[PDB]
């Protein structure tokens, strides 16, 4: 459980704003609270090979949630069912009963999300079901990447690889599309500071 600030390793609660940004009041570290890779101001991130430095920006593997939060629920499903992996879709105007950080910090009750819950979300809202489904992903390990399309794979590969691929000679789609999974699986890791098992 919680969120430990990968600098001085101060450990905060897992309480998401809707927000993957994360700061550490306690050694002023700023964070992606999904993958834990620091969050840079505009024009400060030191990668010399970033493309986007004069934005406010970190650098965020393909399976931090950062990104998964954009792919709707039933292809996150997708991911988890092809992989056998079991998830809610029932619970065990009430709304989402995932409890949020209080707006008064020493209240004496929790405070629910009380947001809109979908059917087959598992009583939960869908930022709260999907954030639920993508910690299944991340600690069953679960390579998003096997369900990109040539697209998402193209894209990935410049992201990640630098490198903008093309077809070989006579190379079909799904030819094409396996040799990019290979490459990307084969050299670019999933999260590594993504809490696993
Ligand atoms: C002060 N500060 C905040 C940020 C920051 C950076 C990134 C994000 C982020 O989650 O991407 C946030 C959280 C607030 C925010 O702007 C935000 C967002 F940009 C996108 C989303 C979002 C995108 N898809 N689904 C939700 C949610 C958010 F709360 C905040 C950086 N500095
Ligand atoms: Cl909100
Ligand atoms: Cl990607
Ligand atoms: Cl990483
Ligand atoms: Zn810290
Ligand atoms: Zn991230
Ligand atoms: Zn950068
Ligand atoms: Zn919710």
Redesign the pocket.
């Known amino acids: 459980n919680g969120i430990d600030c990968p600098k001085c390793k101060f450990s905060y609660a897992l309480a998401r704003?809707?927000?993957?940004?994360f700061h550490c009041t306690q050694c002023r570290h700023?964070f992606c609270s999904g993958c834990y890779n620091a969050?840079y101001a505009k024009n400060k991130c030191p990668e010399p090979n970033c493309r986007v430095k004069k934005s406010?920006h970190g650098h965020h593997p393909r399976d931090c949630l950062?990104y998964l939060?954009?792919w709707t629920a039933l292809r996150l499903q997708k991911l988890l069912q092809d992989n056998n992996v079991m998830f809610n879709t029932e619970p065990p105007g009430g709304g989402c009963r995932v409890i949020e950080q209080k707006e008064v910090p020493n209240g004496l009750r929790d405070e629910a999300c009380g947001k809109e819950t979908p059917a087959g979300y598992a009583g939960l809202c869908q930022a709260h079901y999907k954030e639920y489904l993508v910690s299944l992903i991340n600690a069953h390990s679960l390579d998003p990447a096997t369900l990109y399309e040539v697209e998402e794979l193209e894209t990935a590969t410049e992201r990640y690889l630098h490198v903008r691929p093309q077809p070989l000679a006579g190379e079909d789609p799904p030819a094409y599309q396996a040799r990019l999974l290979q490459k990307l699986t084969e050299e670019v890791p999933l999260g590594q500071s993504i809490p696993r098992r």
């Open positions: 704003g809707g927000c993957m940004h700023q969050f406010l950062f939060r954009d």
